[PDB]
């Protein structure tokens, strides 16, 4: 079983610019572990598999959260640290194009459809239970949990938004944008590390190590 109520409860329980962005990311990594443990059945998975899932998904999971958080923000994002980062500040820091991708492909789409917190929570749980993650001891178990999440989300959408029959598909179709943006932000982080001017804290550093 995978009730959306527990997923929603998980979301509610955890509620230059590049430097400030990296601080927030590190900060939210601690919070993410807490979120994942509150997602039904995650803690019962083998510890090694919990490690694989969080290492595979952390970036996408964190991007989804700050994007939804930014829905009331005009042309900007709200960091978990309380900092509002505007589009102009991103451009003038050399990361304008990727910043705009987040705004147009994620934040704005979440805003235009009024994506709610149960929906965000489900999409994140789906991202968490990624059966393509390399090294898993039982991908079939993870797949099964993913299927349960999206069965519940679909039922939740049919019930809460019956006048929007395409809503469920619309939600799932933000996941390719998220994947792509996650991979681009990670590329940037590796570069910030390489150049060596940007402070990168310990949990963020550990995510950047090889498996």
């Amino acid at each position: 079983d995978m009730p959306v109520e527990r997923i929603l409860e998980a979301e509610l329980a955890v509620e230059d610019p590049v430097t400030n962005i990296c601080q927030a990311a590190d900060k939210q990594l601690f919070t993410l572990v807490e979120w994942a443990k509150r997602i039904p059945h995650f803690s019962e998975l083998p510890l090694d598999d919990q490690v694989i899932l969080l290492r595979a998904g952390w970036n996408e999971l964190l991007i989804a959260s700050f994007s939804h958080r930014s829905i009331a923000v005009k042309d900007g994002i709200l960091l978990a640290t309380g900092l509002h980062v505007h589009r102009n500040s991103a451009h003038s820091a050399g990361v304008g194009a990727i910043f705009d991708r987040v705004l147009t492909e994620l934040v704005s789409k979440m805003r235009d459809m009024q994506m709610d917190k149960t929906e965000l929570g489900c999409l994140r749980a789906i991202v968490l239970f990624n059966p393509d993650s390399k090294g898993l001891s039982n991908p079939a178990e993870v797949e099964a949990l993913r299927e349960k999440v999206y069965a519940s989300l679909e039922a939740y959408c049919k019930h809460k938004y019956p006048e929007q029959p395409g809503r469920f598909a619309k939600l799932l179709l933000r996941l390719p944008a998220l994947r792509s943006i996650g991979l681009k932000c990670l590329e940037h982080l590796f570069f910030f590390k390489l150049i060596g001017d940007t402070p990168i804290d310990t949990f963020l550093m550990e995510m950047l190590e090889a498996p």
Binding site: V33, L47, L54, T202, F203, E206
Partner: peptide
């Protein structure tokens, strides 16, 4: 991956 292991442990 010491930090993650430690936090998942509890």
């Amino acid at each position: 991956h010491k930090i993650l292991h430690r936090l998942l442990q509890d």
